[PDB]
Amino acid sequence: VGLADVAVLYSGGKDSNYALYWALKSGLRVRYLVSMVSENNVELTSLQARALGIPIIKGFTEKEKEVEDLKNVLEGLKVDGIVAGALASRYQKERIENVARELGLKVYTPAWEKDPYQYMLEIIKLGFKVVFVAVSAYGLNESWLGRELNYKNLEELKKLSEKYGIHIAGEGGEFETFVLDMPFFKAKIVIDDAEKFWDGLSGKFIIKRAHLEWK
Amino acid sequence: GLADVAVLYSGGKDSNYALYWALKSGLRVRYLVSMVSEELTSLQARALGIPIIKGFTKKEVEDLKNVLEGLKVDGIVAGALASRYQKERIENVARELGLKVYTPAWEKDPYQYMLEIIKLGFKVVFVAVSAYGLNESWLGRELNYKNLEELKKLSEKYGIHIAGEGGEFETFVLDMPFFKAKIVIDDAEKFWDGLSGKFIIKRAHLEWK
Numbered sequence: 001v002g003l004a005d006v007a008v009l010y011s012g013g014k015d016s017n018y019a020l021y022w023a024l025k026s027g028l029r030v031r032y033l034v035s036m037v038s039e040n041n042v043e044l045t046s047l048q049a050r051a052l053g054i055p056i057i058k059g060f061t062e063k064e065k066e067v068e069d070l071k072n073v074l075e076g077l078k079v080d081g082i083v084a085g086a087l088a089s090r091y092q093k094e095r096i097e098n099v100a101r102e103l104g105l106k107v108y109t110p111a112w113e114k115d116p117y118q119y120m121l122e123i124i125k126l127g128f129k130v131v132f133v134a135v136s137a138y139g140l141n142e143s144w145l146g147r148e149l150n151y152k153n154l155e156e157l158k159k160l161s162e163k164y165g166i167h168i169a170g171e172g173g174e175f176e177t178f179v180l181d182m183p184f185f186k187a188k189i190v191i192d193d194a195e196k197f198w199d200g201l202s203g204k205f206i207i208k209r210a211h212l213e214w215k
Numbered sequence: 216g217l218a219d220v221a222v223l224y225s226g227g228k229d230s231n232y233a234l235y236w237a238l239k240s241g242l243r244v245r246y247l248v249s250m251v252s253e254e255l256t257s258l259q260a261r262a263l264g265i266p267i268i269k270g271f272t273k274k275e276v277e278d279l280k281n282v283l284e285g286l287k288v289d290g291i292v293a294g295a296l297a298s299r300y301q302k303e304r305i306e307n308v309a310r311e312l313g314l315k316v317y318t319p320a321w322e323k324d325p326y327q328y329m330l331e332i333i334k335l336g337f338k339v340v341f342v343a344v345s346a347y348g349l350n351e352s353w354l355g356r357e358l359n360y361k362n363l364e365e366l367k368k369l370s371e372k373y374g375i376h377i378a379g380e381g382g383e384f385e386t387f388v389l390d391m392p393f394f395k396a397k398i399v400i401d402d403a404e405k406f407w408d409g410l411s412g413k414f415i416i417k418r419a420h421l422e423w424k
Binding site: 005031032043046049050053055056057058059060072073075076077078079 | 219245287
């Protein structure tokens with residue numbers, strides 16, 4: 001119980017968790033984490049759910065139709081609004097506002113239009129333990145895979161942003177992140193084993209095995 | 216919407232029979248609900264095209280009610296075969312939420328039940344065995360008429376429940392009428408200490424119909 005009942009668009013990244021953090025911490029009642037995946041880092045979202053103790057809904061969707069699948073997942077949930085993690089992208093926001101619109105749901109975008117750099121700093125301050133699980137930008141080499149976001153690493157992104165033109169927050173797909181731990185997790189996600197994959201321009205950090213260390 | 220329901224799903228033959236019935240009856244299954252306590256069901260959810268809700272726990276009756284409370288359904292379909300305990304707890308939870316309860320498998324003959332599963336086109340495999348009489352050859356084995364008979368005879372000589380209600384085994388469904396893709400196992404390993412075992416699917420993919 002709280003001010004409102006909501007669902008949080010969840011994928012495991014820094015953004016989804018940030019939005020999720022903001023909902024919880026500001027008294028919102030989070031009924032479900034809604035993780036939609038399309039045919040192409042998410043089998044990990046189930047651990048975060050077990051660690052958060054919040055039911056997670058896995059949706060499966062060929063584009064231009066996935067909007068319906070996401071709509072039909074929300075449609076059947078007794079909630080007042082959806083909490084998303086957008087920060088700058090507008091085309092993403094548009095699509096999400098339209099589904100919420102047709103469903104009569106209030107949209108909450110807690111990261112919206114906030115400085116990328118101060119944003120990254122904020123995530124570090126709040127105590128987020130974040131890992132880079134993918135990179136795909138000129139200037140970000142194989143050494144970022146599996147690296148943990150810290151004050152040290154952040155300044156390096158800024159430096160590389162102020163050189164190659166990469167978004168400091170991974171906007172547009174520069175990189176992907178996975179959250180091992182944040183204040184509302186009841187357990188920590190420690191990586192037991194994982195391997196890297198570098199195709200020569202882009203990279204991926206695949207987590208083989210991992211467990212939870214309850215706080 | 217009178218036709219809107221949530222199905223308690225665990226991936227075994229029972230859950231899938233329950234879902235088969237609801238879909239067959241024309242009900243609108245909006246969510247598969249899977250409660251876990253101290254990969255696979257997600258593959259099935261994907262094959263079905265039906266959103267699956269994962270709730271966790273470690274008491275669990277409350278967590279289930281918590282999951283079900285927020286869904287816009289008129290009823291919940293369960294796969295209970297003969298256990299009154301499970302059925303009572305589920306019916307009590309439905310009542311508390313003003314939901315109808317469906318138990319399509321309820322007390323129907325074990326053996327005929329297994330025959331029907333097969334007849335309907337179900338692809339079911341034994342992923343666990345723990346009963347004198349059942350050797351390691353059942354691990355990863357696919358339920359068909361030939362072995363259903365082989366099993367029946369074992370139930371007449373060792374007294375093992377034919378549908379495994381006594382816990383003599385566990386099943387996993389690779390395919391059934393409403394799956395849009397078959398689950399195809401690419402790699403699996405068997406654990407067997409000489410008395411009890413497990414069939415563990417390590418790698419699998421969906422093969423779309």
